[PDB]
Amino acid sequence: PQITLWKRPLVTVKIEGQLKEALLDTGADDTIFEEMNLPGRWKPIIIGGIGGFIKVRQYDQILIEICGHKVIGTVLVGPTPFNVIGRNLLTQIGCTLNF
Amino acid sequence: PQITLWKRPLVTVKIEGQLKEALLDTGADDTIFEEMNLPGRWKPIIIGGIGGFIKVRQYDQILIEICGHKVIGTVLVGPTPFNVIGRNLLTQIGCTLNF
Numbered sequence: 001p002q003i004t005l006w007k008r009p010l011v012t013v014k015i016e017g018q019l020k021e022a023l024l025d026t027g028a029d030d031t032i033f034e035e036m037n038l039p040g041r042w043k044p045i046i047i048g049g050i051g052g053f054i055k056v057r058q059y060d061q062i063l064i065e066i067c068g069h070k071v072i073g074t075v076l077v078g079p080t081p082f083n084v085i086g087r088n089l090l091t092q093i094g095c096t097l098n099f
Numbered sequence: 100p101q102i103t104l105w106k107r108p109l110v111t112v113k114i115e116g117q118l119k120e121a122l123l124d125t126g127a128d129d130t131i132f133e134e135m136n137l138p139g140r141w142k143p144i145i146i147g148g149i150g151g152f153i154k155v156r157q158y159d160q161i162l163i164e165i166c167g168h169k170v171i172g173t174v175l176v177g178p179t180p181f182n183v184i185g186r187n188l189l190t191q192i193g194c195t196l197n198f
């Protein structure tokens with residue numbers, strides 16, 4: 001689908017049987033989510049953004065279904081004010097910016 | 100132009116005679132830049148991100164030239180680690196996400 005930018009690019013995602021809206025963020029290298037449980041072992045990491053840094057739990061090989069499209073990749077879990085889909089996953093769906 | 104997301108969507112920008120690379124950020128409501136002087140008065144404001152908050156000087160009706168396209172709108176100046184082009188300006192060029 002084509003998405004304009006007059007409103008926040010929210011999309012519903014299915015991840016670990018959980019339904020959530022997520023922000024298609026081209027400014028995000030990686031995908032981070034609010035607190036929720038996921039499969040496998042994880043590494044603690046710190047990510048930097050506007051205003052400072054936050055500690056998050058790093059998880060690899062996470063299944064997310066995004067607007068009917070399937071993807072697997074790294075998903076970080078931490079105190080983000082919003083769920084964002086970063087570029088690590090936007091690529092796999094062939095998402096592009098266009099103007 | 101069509102832009103893939105395997106690398107950061109950086110673009111060269113011209114703003115107040117200054118050349119700058121900026122991040123096309125669909126996760127950014129507004130456009131912010133690192134410290135720089137711009138003409139006229141400004142209002143102090145606070146913006147929120149993943150790491151926390153920062154105070155920035157708000158300027159309205161700012162001319163920015165982006166990859167050959169011209170736009171005018173609000174541009175904030177503050178301690179961002181990167182210059183980002185938020186949705187307040189991404190719309191005016193008719194930028195869209197596509198997958």
Ligand SMILES: CC(C)CN(C[C@@H](O)[C@H](Cc1ccccc1)NC(=O)O[C@H]1CO[C@H]2OCC[C@H]21)S(=O)(=O)c1ccc(N)cc1
Pocket residue numbers: 025026027028029030031032047048049050081082084086124125126127128129130131146147148149150180181183185
């Ligand atoms: C700091 C930059 C490199 C931009 N980043 C993504 C960006 O889209 C954030 C994503 C974002 C969105 C909402 C809240 C926090 C962070 N946008 C943002 O900070 O927006 C603020 C300026 O315009 C306003 O719009 C809303 C918040 C304000 S980031 O959050 O820090 C980031 C960096 C690395 C990763 N892996 C994931 C996210």
